[PDB]
Ligand binder design. Sequence first.
Ligand SMILES: CN1CCN(CCCN2c3ccccc3Sc3ccc(C(F)(F)F)cc32)CC1
Ligand SMILES: CN1CCN(CCCN2c3ccccc3Sc3ccc(C(F)(F)F)cc32)CC1
Ligand SMILES: CN1CCN(CCCN2c3ccccc3Sc3ccc(C(F)(F)F)cc32)CC1
Ligand SMILES: CN1CCN(CCCN2c3ccccc3Sc3ccc(C(F)(F)F)cc32)CC1
Ligand SMILES: [Ca+2]
Ligand SMILES: [Ca+2]
Ligand SMILES: [Ca+2]
Ligand SMILES: [Ca+2]
Length: 146
Amino acid sequence: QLTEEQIAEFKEAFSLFDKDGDGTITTKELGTVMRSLGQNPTEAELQDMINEVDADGNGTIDFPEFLTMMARKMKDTDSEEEIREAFRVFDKDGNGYISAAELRHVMTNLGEKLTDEEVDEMIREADIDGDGQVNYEEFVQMMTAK
Ligand SMILES: CN1CCN(CCCN2c3ccccc3Sc3ccc(C(F)(F)F)cc32)CC1
Ligand SMILES: CN1CCN(CCCN2c3ccccc3Sc3ccc(C(F)(F)F)cc32)CC1
Ligand SMILES: CN1CCN(CCCN2c3ccccc3Sc3ccc(C(F)(F)F)cc32)CC1
Ligand SMILES: CN1CCN(CCCN2c3ccccc3Sc3ccc(C(F)(F)F)cc32)CC1
Ligand SMILES: [Ca+2]
Ligand SMILES: [Ca+2]
Ligand SMILES: [Ca+2]
Ligand SMILES: [Ca+2]
């Protein structure tokens, strides 16, 4: 079940979307985060994404709704392609490995300022074989909660 550590981590993640700190993520905020990741949704696709997670139907996502979404899990059968595309946003040089440098660049473009200690830790926790990098297989497992 949801650990307290995961809750604080998810609250941190929540703040990457909730730019203005008003406690809700709007389509505008979702749009700017997606664009920072090289994605380009239309105002309509942005609305569908919010509506899939919007529980009380008020058009925006508050922390409980985000936590709920984040809390839940699915198998790798759940669009391996989405995972593939996400991997590609990190693996900027296309070599098949996410380096600490690549992880840092992505985070910075997202507006998250990590030190060296934090980047290595994020890497260390996803790294299975111990080479200090995250390959696609390691990435998949991080995502599929297994
Ligand atoms: C001031 N100092 C700034 C950096 N933040 C957290 C750094 C990134 N971070 C992180 C890194 C290592 C170990 C735990 C965590 S919590 C966390 C949760 C989500 C994200 C995310 F957002 F990337 F998904 C990033 C982090 C801690 C406080
Ligand atoms: C049922 N299953 C669960 C719901 N979604 C998963 C996450 C929802 N959502 C989303 C939708 C489409 C594509 C990517 C994403 S990531 C994401 C990030 C933030 C939010 C935001 F902003 F709303 F918080 C909503 C989403 C897929 C379908
Ligand atoms: C639950 N247990 C811990 C979580 N995962 C590893 C998560 C590593 N990870 C991370 C770690 C702490 C805080 C936030 C994040 S988000 C994130 C994003 C990219 C990567 C990247 F790019 F390196 F792969 C790794 C992580 C492994 C299983
Ligand atoms: C428990 N089960 C719940 C669902 N997933 C959530 C996705 C992984 N994720 C993550 C992992 C550990 C700690 C914090 C986070 S927030 C986060 C932010 C970005 C990414 C990234 F990298 F994709 F950009 C991945 C994650 C984790 C495992
Ligand atoms: Ca907001
Ligand atoms: Ca809502
Ligand atoms: Ca790479
Ligand atoms: Ca590795």
